[PDB]
TrEMBL record, chain A:
Residues that coordinate or bind GTP 1: R263, K335, K359, R554, K711
Organism annotation: Neurospora crassa
Assigned EC number: 2.7.7.48
Entry's Gene Ontology BP terms: siRNA processing
Binding site for Mg(2+) 2: G597
Annotated protein name in UniProt: RNA-dependent RNA polymerase
Range within the parent protein: 390 to 1372 of 1402
Amino-acid positions noted as binding Mg(2+) 1 in the UniProt annotation, renumbered to this chain: D301, D599, D601
GO molecular function per UniProt: ATP binding; GTP binding; identical protein binding; metal ion binding; RNA binding; RNA-directed RNA polymerase activity
Highest taxon of the lineage: Eukaryota
Boundaries of every RDRP core domain copy: 124-762
N-terminal signal peptide: none
The keyword Cell membrane is assigned to this record: no
Protein residues bound to Mg(2+) 4: D599, D601, D603
Record family assignment: Belongs to the RdRP family.
Gene field: qde-1
UniProtKB/TrEMBL annotation, chain B:
Major enzyme class: transferase
Organism name: Neurospora crassa
Binding positions for GTP 1 per the UniProt entry: R251, K323, K347, R542, K699
Keywords: ATP-binding, Calcium, GTP-binding, Metal-binding, Nucleotide-binding, Nucleotidyltransferase, RNA-binding, RNA-directed RNA polymerase, Transferase
Binding-site residues, Mg(2+) 3: G585, D587
Residues where Mg(2+) 1 binds: D289, D587, D589
Stated name of the protein: RNA-dependent RNA polymerase
Length: 937, 920
DNA sequence: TATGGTCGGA
DNA sequence: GAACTATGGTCGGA
RNA sequence: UCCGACC
RNA sequence: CCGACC
C-alpha cells in the first residue's frame, strides 16, 4: 500500500517515556506539550528525566512548567496555558464539571521536511480545554476521547506534499494508518471510530489553506487500564463494543452501514443532560402523524410532545427564566424537537417518541438511553435580515419585479440612514454614545469568562469597550480624535459587511424553530406564532401574529417554492407555545417539507411579516425534480451485507463494525462537491438571470442531494460532475464569477442583476454619502489635561538636576519602545503588542521622590504615580507623531489623569472601581433618557 | 362678621405705580423678593430698571436690588417673558399659598400671603384658550374648619364663614396689576402651614381686566373678559340650564384638567352617537359608560405627539364635553382621522365648533402594567365570599409566610458574595431620581449620603460586606429598617395581580362573565410569565371596595378579535347590568380594575349579587336646584344669565366648603365592622351605602352635616359611642387571646412571628491592613528623615484636633448634615519638594491628590479601633481609592477611575451576576 | 477554487 | 369638650 | 479573526 | 413634600 508514505507514518505521534509513566493524564498531556514547544526530546537523556512527585498535586500548570524551565534547554516564551479551572478538573474532577468535559485535542499539519525517514505530519497538542459534554463522554469518560484535525489525504491542493500526491495508493495507506490499529499517546492506545469534514483550515504557522478532517479516537487500553470508576482506573473496552452500546447493532443490520456510521454523531452532539425517565414514562409511537388526505406523507417529522413537568425540570436544570415551549435534543435513538403538551393537566413525567425521530432501533433500557439530552431551547427572538439566496427567489416570485427591487432597496437606504442618524445624534453627548456602544455590541461573555474586561496592553481589547472605558473616565467622543477614529473604523466595517453580504435588515422578521400542530387546530397554509415577550420593530411591537400573511423559508433556498406565503392565525388553543412557529398538520404535504425539504427536528424557518415584502409574493408549486441517478451513485450496502463476508456471531459482528469504520472513512474522505456545484449554480443563474428555468431547477436538485450526501451514501466524483455539465447543463464548464463578488462595479452600464443593483446602485452610493455626512458632522488629539504630570515634572526638573536625569531616561526609553512598535509574522498582533508593552512597563524609576513615585507598597506598580508621569510625558512627546503608541500603551493611566483632572470640588466624587466590579456594571438606559430630558427643559 | 371683614380689607400685596409698566413676570418676581426680604413696595430710590424688561435670568433683576429666595428656573422665566407663558404645552402657573396670620391684632390681615415661584405645569383647555397668564391658583385654609388653630376671630364669631366666602366671590381681587375673580374651588386636603395641620381649599381665579387690558393676543395685550363669559364659553350655559347647578359647577374641572393636546379633529371627522350601547336584555342599563372608539390614525398621532414607544390601545382624555376613555377600533381598515362620542361621555351639550372644543386632550395612556397587592379593604370581602373561610385564611397566610422567607433567604445568600449583594441593594431602592437630579451620586462629606449607595460605592472599590464591619453594620441597619417597615404596614403582594384600565366590548365577542386581557409585553411572576390571560378564572374589583359584591369572579377568554388591544381589560356588553357597575358602581371613563389571576386567591370565591341599598334620604339630602331655577330669580336675558352664573359660583363655593364626612364615616365603618367581624350584616351595608354616596357628594349635591351624622348613628348604628381602633392599627397584639380578625391574624399570627424570627437571627473587622498602606509608607520615610517626620507629626496632631471636633458635633445633639459638613471642612482643611508630590496643585480637586490618601490612611490607622464612624464619614472616599489600588493585581485586569457623572449612570447587570455566580 | 443559515465560546 | 375626629386606589413631579 | 456544536 | 386621576 504505497510503502513510501508508510515509512513516514511510523512515528507521527510523540513518544511517552517510562519516567512519565506514573503521571496524571493532564500532567502527561501538559508536560509533553512544553517539550514539543521547546524542541526538547521527551526521551533526551541529557536531562535528569525524573518525575517530580510535586506535579501529582498541582492546580496551576505554570508550577509544573516552572520546574522544567529550571533546566537550561527549556529556558523561550511559555505556550498557551490550560485555564486553572480546567486543569483542576482534569486532575481532581474526573474530567467532568457542571456538564462540561475537558477535551484532549490536536491539530496535525504536513511536515515541511520531505526527508524519506521523517514524520509525514507535524503534531501540535492543543491545551486542555473545557467543552460541553455528550452522551459518549458521560458514559465512557471524557478522558477516553481524542479528536484531531488532519489534512484530507484527497486534497487536490498545490501545497500538498509530493510523497502523497504522486503515490497512487497514498490515500489508502493513510486511511489504513488511521483505522487498522491503535495509536499510542500519553500512555493510551487510541482507536478511530468517527470522522467528519472540518472544512478548509489554514496550516498552523508554528510549523496555504487545506481541507482538514476531524477524526475521533476512543481509548481502548492504557498502562493504568485494567482487564475484566475513576479516570486512572478504567477498564479495557473495544471501539466495536462502544459502537454496539450506542447503536445496538444486532437490531440494526438492515441499515446501510454508511448511514449507521453517520448516526455516531448523535452520541457526540454537545448536550446538557436533564433527567432520566422511567420506562413506564416513555410513550413510543408506532406510527407518525399522517396526512389526513391519505397521501401517506408524514406531518410531524422529528417532533413529539413532552409533559409540562418535563419542561419544568428543563428550566430548573438549565436555570431558565421561564418554562420553554419547545426544546431541541436527543433521547435514546430519538433526535428532534419536543414541545409541551398543551393538554397536560397532570404532574406526571412523560415523553413520547415517533418513528421519524428514532434514527435506529433501540430498546431504551440503560439509563443513558433514556436520558433527555438538550442541545438548545426555544429562546427570545431577534430580528433577522435578508441573504443573497432569498433575493433571486423573492424577485422570481414577485407579481411586479420592479416594485420588489424598490421595496427591498428602500429598506436598505432607510436602514442605513437610521443607523447613522442614531450614531450621529449620540456622538454629541458622551452619556448617549456610551449607551449606543453598549447597544451596538455586548461583551458579557468575555466579561464573565475573564472576571474582568480583557485588556490588551493599556486599553481594553475590544474597540467598543475601549471607547466606553475612556468616556467613563471623562473623554468626549467629539473632543478627542482617538475616540473618533475608533467610531469611524467601527462604522466603516459594519458598512463593509453590508456591502459584502447585503444582510438587509427586516425588523418584521426572525428565525423561529419550526413545530407541527399535534392538535389539528391550524388549517392547511395557516401558521401560529406567539412571542414570549414584546417583539419591537421601530414604533410598532408584537406579542403574536394574527390576521396577516407571512413569508416562511429555510436556508439554503434554491427552488422557486423554497419560500412560501401563508396566513398567520393565532389559535388561543396554542397560546402557551411561545417563541416557535407552528405549521399545520393538515393538507397533502407538510409545509416544512416545502421549505427546502425541511422538517421539525431542529429546523429554523425564516419568518417575515413585513407587508412591503410579503404582499408582492406569489407562491410557486413544488417542482418536478430531474432523475439524477445516472450521476449520483448511491451506496446502500447494509451492515448485514457487510457481515456476510465474515460470517455470524460476535467475532463476525466485531469484524464487520471495523469494516464499517474504514469503509465509511473512505466514503467520508471522497472529495466533496457541495461547494463547487452551489457556486456553479450561482454563476449560471446569474448569467441567465434566472432561478426558475430548466437548468436552474436541476442544479437546485443536485445541490439538494449533495447536501444530504453523508446520510444517503451518494458517490459523486469530478468525472460525474463534468458529465452532468455536458449532458444536461449545456456544455459550459467554467463560468465567470459574478460582478457582486467584486468590491467595485467592474460591469458595463447600469447593473442588471438584483444583487448587483442593490450592492452597486443602492448600497455603495448610500454608504459613501452617509459616511461623508458622518465625517462632516464630526476634534484634536491634544488635551492639556493629559500633560499635567509632564508640566509638573519639567518644573521640578528645571529647579532640580537630580530629577532631570530621570526625565531624560524616561523620554529616551519611550522612544525606544515606539521604535519597537514600528509586518505579518508567525507571532500575531497580540503577541507583538504584549512584547512592546513589556518594554513599556519595564521603564521604571531605577530617593524620597523615587519612593513617592514608585509607591512600592502597591503590588501593581501600574497604579503608582510614576506610571502617571511616564504616560503624560509620552502623550506630550508623541500625541501627533504616533497616536496609537501613546494610547495602546498608556491609555489606562491617561484615563486616570483625566478623571483626576476633570473632578471639581464639591461636585461629587470619582470612583476607582476594581476590574471585576467594573466588568459587572451596565449603562442604565432609563437614566440616560431622564438626564437628557432634564437638559432640554 | 365686622371684625373678620376689617381684617380682610388688605390681604394682598400692593401694586405700586413704579411697577405698572413692568412685565407681569418681572412684577411677580419683584413682589416675591421684597416680601421674602420684608421690604415695603410703597420712599427709597426704588425706580423701574429698564434692564428688567430684557432680562433672561431673574437673578439679574434681583441683583439690581442690592440697596438692602427660591428662584424660578431660567427656562420658565424666558417662557414667561418672551414665550407668552406657554412652552411645549407647559403653562407657567401663578400660584400662592395663604395661611392664617399669627398676629391676632385687629385691623391686621387675617391671611398671610406667599407668592410661589413661577413654575411649569401641564396646560389645560382653559389656559390654552384664554392664556395661562389669566389664571391664578391659591391654597387657602377652609373657613368651615373645627381645628383648634383656627384663629378665634373666625371660630368665635359665627357668620365669619359667610364673610370669607363673600370676600372670595363678591368681587375682584387686585394682584400684580390684574383684577382677579374666583370661578372654581376644590378640596386640597389637610396642608401643614409654612413658618399644626389644617384643611385647605384650592381656589381658582381668572383675570377679567387689568392695567394692560383692552375693552371690547400677547400676555400684556389682553382683552377684558368676565368669568360669567368664560364659563359660558366652556359650558354653553344657554343649552345646559337644565342641569343641577352644582353638577354644572363640577364640570368646570374638565376645563382645568391637566392634559396634553394631541390634535384638533374637523367636524366631519366626529361621530356623535345619540344613544349609548344598552343591555341586550332590555334593562336599559348602559354598557359603554365613558368609553368610545377612535381611529387607528388618531392613536398613531397620540404616539407621535407624546413620544410613545408604541401605538396606545386606549387613552384617557377629554374631547369637548366628552370625558372618558377611547379605544382603537379593531375593525378600522382605513387611514382617516375619526373619533366617536357617546351620551355617557358628554357631561354637557357642546356644539363642537370651536377648535378648543374639538381638540382631543389626553391625560393618560394605557401603559406597561405593574404587579399589585391586596389592600386591607379587599381582605374582609374575600373572606366573606370564601366557600371555606379557613382555607382562604390558610392560603393568604401560607403565601405571606413563603414570601417573607424567600426575601430574607435572598438577602442572606446575596451577602456571601459582593457581586450578589450589590444586585440586592440596587433592587432594594432606586437612586435614579436622585442621580438624574444631581448628575451624580449625592455625597455628604467623604461618603454617599444614602447608606444604600455607600454600600455599593465601597463594594465597587473592593470592600467586602462580610469582611469589613463598617459595611456589615450598614447592611444590618438597613435590614432592621425594612423589617420595622414590614411590621407597621401589612402589605400582602400578589405577583399575578395588576390594576388595569377597564374597557367595554363594542364588537360583541365576550359573553356575560367573560373578560379579555392581553399585555403589551411579558408580565413576569417568579414562577411563570404571561403575555395574555386565557382559560382561567380571575377576580375583578375596584377601590374603594365595601359591599360584598364589590369583588367578582369572571372567566378570562382571549379573543383573537381583540388581540390588538393591549394593557387593557375588556368587559362584556351583554347581560342585565354592566360588570363595571358591580365594582363599586364603576364605569369605563378611566376606572382601573384590580385583576387577580392567582389560583389560590381566586378559587374559593363565590360571587354575590348586588345588594339592595337602604334609603338614607333622612340623613342624605340632595340639592337638585337647576340653573334655570337660579335664573328665574333674576329674570331673562344676558344680564340675568350673567348674575345667575356668579350666583352658581357663590352657592357652589358654600356647598364645596361643607365639612366633609367621607374620612370619618369610612373610618367608623372600619372600626364597627371590625368589632362585628362582619362586612355583610345590617350596619355594614348601611355604612357602605353612606360612604358610597359621600364620595359622589360634589356631583350629586348631597348635603350632610354633623346633625345628620349624629342622628344616623343614633338610630341605625351605635351612636355617640367613640369606637376604638382595631388592634391591627397598632404595631403589636395588645388584645386578649389569639387573634381572630383576618387582618389581626395575618399581621399578628403570621407576619409578626416570621419577621421576628429573622430579626432574632473569623468574621467582620474594622481593621484592614490595606488601608494603612500609605501610613506605614510615610513612617518608613519619616524614620530616616526629620523634615517629613515633623510634617507627619503635625498632620497626625491635626487629625487629632478634627477627631475631637467630630465628638463635639456628630457624636450627639444646627441640623445633622450641617454639623458633618462643618467637621468635613475642618478635615479638608488639614493640608501641608515632597510637599509638591504629596499635594498636586494642578488638580483642582484637592480630595484627589496624594495627600488626601495619606491623611485618610493615618486617620484610619490611628482611629480604626476608637473612632470608626469618624474615619469613614470623612475619608471613605480615599479609603475606597486606597482599597481599589491595593487590591489591583499585576495582569489581573485594570481598575477604572470613573467620573461622578459617568459613575452615576451605570447599573448592576443582573445577567453578569447570575452567570458569574454559576461557575463559582 | 470548494454552499448557505441559526447559535455559543464551559 | 382637653377628651368627638378626617377613605381607598392609580400614576407622575420634585 | 480563530475555535465549537446545530439545520 | 408638590401635582393630576378614579
Ligand atoms: N452543511 C450544510 N449546508 C447547508 N445546508 C445544510 C447543511 N447541513 C444541513 N443542512 C440542511 O439540513 C438538511 C438536513 O436535514 P437533517 O439534518 O434533518 N437530516 P435528514 O436528511 O433529515 O436525516 P435525519 O438525520 O433527519 O434522519 C439539509 O437537507 C439542508 O437543508
Ligand atoms: N377622592 C376619592 N376617594 C375615593 N374614591 C374616589 C375618589 N374620587 C373618586 N373616587 C371613586 O370614583 C368614583 C367616581 O366616578 P366618576 O369619576 O366616574 N364620577 P361619576 O359620579 O360617575 O360622574 P361622571 O363625572 O362620570 O358623570 C367614586 O364613586 C369612587 O368609587
Ligand atoms: Ca430533508
Ligand atoms: Ca431537519
Ligand atoms: Ca430530519
Ligand atoms: Ca368613573
Ligand atoms: Ca362616570
Ligand atoms: Ca458554513
Ligand atoms: Ca388620599
Ligand atoms: Mg358610578
Amino acid at each position: 500500500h504505497a510503502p513510501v508514505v508508510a515509512a513516514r507514518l511510523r512515528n507521527i505521534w510523540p513518544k511517552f517515556p517510562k519516567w512519565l509513566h506514573e503521571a496524571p493524564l493532564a500532567v502527561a498531556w501538559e508536560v509533553t506539550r512544553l517539550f514539543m514547544h521547546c524542541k526538547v526530546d521527551l526521551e533526551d537523556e541529557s536531562l535528569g528525566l525524573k518525575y517530580d512527585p510535586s506535579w501529582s498535586t498541582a492546580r496551576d500548570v505554570t508550577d509544573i512548567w516552572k520546574t522544567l524551565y529550571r533546566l537550561d534547554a527549556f529556558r523561550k516564551p511559555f505556550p498557551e496555558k490550560p485555564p486553572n479551572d480546567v486543569f483542576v478538573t482534569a486532575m481532581t474532577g474526573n474530567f467532568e464539571s457542571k456538564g462540561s468535559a475537558v477535551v484532549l485535542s490536536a491539530v496535525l499539519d504536513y511536515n515541511p521536511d520531505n526527508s524519506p525517514t521523517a514524520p509525514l505530519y507535524l503534531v501540535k497538542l492543543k491545551p486542555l480545554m473545557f467543552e460541553q459534554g455528550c452522551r459518549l463522554t458521560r458514559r465512557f469518560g471524557p478522558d477516553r476521547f481524542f479528536e484531531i484535525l488532519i489534512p484530507s489525504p484527497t486534497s487536490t491542493s498545490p501545497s500538498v506534499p509530493p510523497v502523497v500526491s504522486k503515490q497512487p495508493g497514498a490515500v489508502e495507506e493513510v486511511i489504513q494508518w488511521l483505522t487498522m490499529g491503535q495509536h499510542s499517546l500519553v500512555g493510551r492506545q487510541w482507536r478511530a471510530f468517527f470522522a467528519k469534514d472540518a472544512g478548509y483550515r489554514k496550516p498552523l504557522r508554528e510549523f496555504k489553506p487545506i481541507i482538514k478532517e476531524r477524526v475521533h479516537f476512543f481509548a481502548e487500553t492504557g498502562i493504568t487500564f485494567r482487564p475484566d470508576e475513576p479516570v486512572e482506573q478504567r477498564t479495557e473496552f473495544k471501539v466495536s463494543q462502544m459502537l454496539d452500546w450506542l447503536l445496538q447493532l444486532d437490531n440494526n443490520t438492515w441499515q446501510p452501514h454508511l448511514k449507521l456510521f453517520s448516526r455516531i454523531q448523535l452520541g457526540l452532539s454537545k448536550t446538557y443532560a436533564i433527567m432520566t425517565l422511567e420506562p413506564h414514562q416513555i410513550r413510543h409511537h408506532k406510527t407518525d402523524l399522517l396526512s389526513p388526505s391519505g397521501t401517506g406523507e408524514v406531518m410531524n417529522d422529528g417532533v413529539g410532545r413532552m409533559s409540562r413537568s418535563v419542561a419544568k425540570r428543563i428550566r430548573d436544570v438549565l436555570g431558565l427564566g421561564d418554562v420553554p415551549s419547545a426544546v431541541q435534543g436527543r433521547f435514546g435513538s430519538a433526535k428532534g424537537m419536543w414541545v409541551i403538551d398543551v393538554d397536560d393537566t397532570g404532574d406526571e413525567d412523560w415523553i413520547e417518541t415517533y418513528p421519524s425521530q428514532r434514527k435506529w432501533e433501540c430498546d431504551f433500557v440503560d439509563k443513558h438511553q433514556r436520558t433527555l439530552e438538550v442541545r438548545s431551547v426555544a429562546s427570545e427572538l431577534k430580528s433577522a435580515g435578508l441573504n443573497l439566496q432569498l433575493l433571486p427567489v423573492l424577485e422570481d416570485r414577485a407579481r411586479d419585479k420592479v416594485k420588489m427591487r424598490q421595496a427591498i432597496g428602500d429598506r436598505l437606504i432607510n436602514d442605513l440612514q437610521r443607523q447613522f442618524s442614531e450614531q450621529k445624534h449620540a456622538l454629541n453627548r458622551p452619556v448617549e454614545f456610551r449607551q449606543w456602544v453598549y447597544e451596538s455590541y455586548s461583551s458579557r461573555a468575555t466579561r464573565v469568562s475573564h472576571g474582568r474586561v480583557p485588556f490588551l496592553a493599556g486599553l481594553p481589547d475590544s474597540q467598543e469597550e475601549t471607547l466606553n472605558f475612556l468616556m467613563n473616565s471623562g473623554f468626549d467622543p467629539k473632543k478627542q480624535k482617538y475616540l473618533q477614529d475608533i467610531a469611524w473604523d467601527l462604522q466603516k466595517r459594519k458598512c463593509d459587511t453590508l456591502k459584502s453580504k447585503l444582510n438587509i435588515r427586516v425588523g418584521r422578521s426572525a428565525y423561529i424553530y419550526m413545530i407541527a400542530d399535534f392538535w389539528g387546530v391550524l388549517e392547511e397554509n395557516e401558521v401560529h406564532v406567539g412571542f414570549s415577550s414584546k417583539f419591537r420593530d421601530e414604533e410598532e411591537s408584537f406579542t403574536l401574529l394574527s390576521d396577516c400573511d407571512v413569508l416562511v423559508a429555510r436556508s439554503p433556498a434554491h427552488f422557486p417554492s423554497d419560500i412560501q406565503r401563508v396566513r398567520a392565525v393565532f389559535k388561543p388553543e396554542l397560546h402557551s407555545l411561545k417563541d416557535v412557529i407552528i405549521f399545520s398538520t393538515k393538507g397533502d404535504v407538510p409545509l416544512a417539507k416545502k421549505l427546502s425539504g425541511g422538517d421539525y427536528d431542529g429546523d429554523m424557518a425564516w419568518v417575515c411579516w413585513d407587508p412591503e415584502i410579503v404582499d408582492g409574493f406569489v407562491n410557486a408549486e413544488m417542482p418536478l425534480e430531474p432523475d439524477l441517478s445516472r450521476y449520483l451513485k448511491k451506496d446502500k450496502t447494509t451492515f448485514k451485507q457487510l457481515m456476510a463476508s465474515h460470517g455470524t456471531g460476535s467475532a463476525a459482528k466485531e469484524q464487520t463494525t471495523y469494516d464499517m469504520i474504514q469503509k465509511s472513512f473512505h466514503f467520508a474522505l471522497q472529495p466533496n462537491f457541495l461547494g463547487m456545484c452551489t457556486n456553479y449554480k450561482e454563476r449560471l443563474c446569474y448569467i441567465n438571470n434566472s432561478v426558475s428555468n430548466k437548468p436552474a431547477i436541476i442544479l437546485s436538485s443536485l445541490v439538494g442531494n449533495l447536501v444530504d450526501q453523508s446520510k444517503q451514501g451518494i458517490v459523486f466524483n469530478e468525472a460525474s460532475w463534468a458529465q452532468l455539465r455536458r449532458e444536461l447543463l449545456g456544455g459550459a464548464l467554467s463560468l465567470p464569477d459574478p460582478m457582486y463578488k467584486s468590491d467595485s462595479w467592474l460591469g458595463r452600464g447600469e447593473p442588471t442583476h438584483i444583487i448587483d443593483y442593490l450592492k452597486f446602485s443602492i448600497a455603495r452610493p448610500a454608504i459613501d454619502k452617509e459616511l461623508e455626512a458622518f465625517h462632516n458632522a464630526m476634534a484634536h488629539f491634544w488635551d492639556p489635561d493629559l500633560a499635567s504630570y509632564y508640566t509638573f515634572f519639567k518644573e521640578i526638573s528645571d529647579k532640580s538636576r537630580s530629577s532631570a536625569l530621570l526625565f531624560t531616561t524616561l523620554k529616551n526609553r519611550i522612544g525606544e519602545v515606539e521604535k519597537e512598535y514600528g509586518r505579518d509574522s508567525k507571532d500575531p498582533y497580540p503577541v507583538r503588542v504584549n512584547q512592546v508593552y513589556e518594554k513599556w512597563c519595564a521603564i521604571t524609576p531605577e530617593s524620597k521622590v523615587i519612593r513617592l513615585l514608585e509607591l512600592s507598597f502597591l503590588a501593581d506598580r501600574e497604579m503608582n504615580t510614576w506610571a502617571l508621569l511616564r504616560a503624560s510625558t509620552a502623550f506630550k512627546l508623541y500625541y501627533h507623531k504616533s497616536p496609537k503608541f501613546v494610547w495602546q500603551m498608556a491609555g489606562r493611566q491617561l484615563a486616570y489623569i483625566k478623571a483626576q483632572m476633570t473632578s471639581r470640588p464639591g461636585e461629587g466624587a470619582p470612583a476607582l472601581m476594581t476590574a471585576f466590579m467594573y466588568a459587572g456594571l451596565m449603562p442604565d438606559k432609563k437614566f440616560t433618557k431622564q438626564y437628557v430630558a432634564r437638559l432640554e427643559g
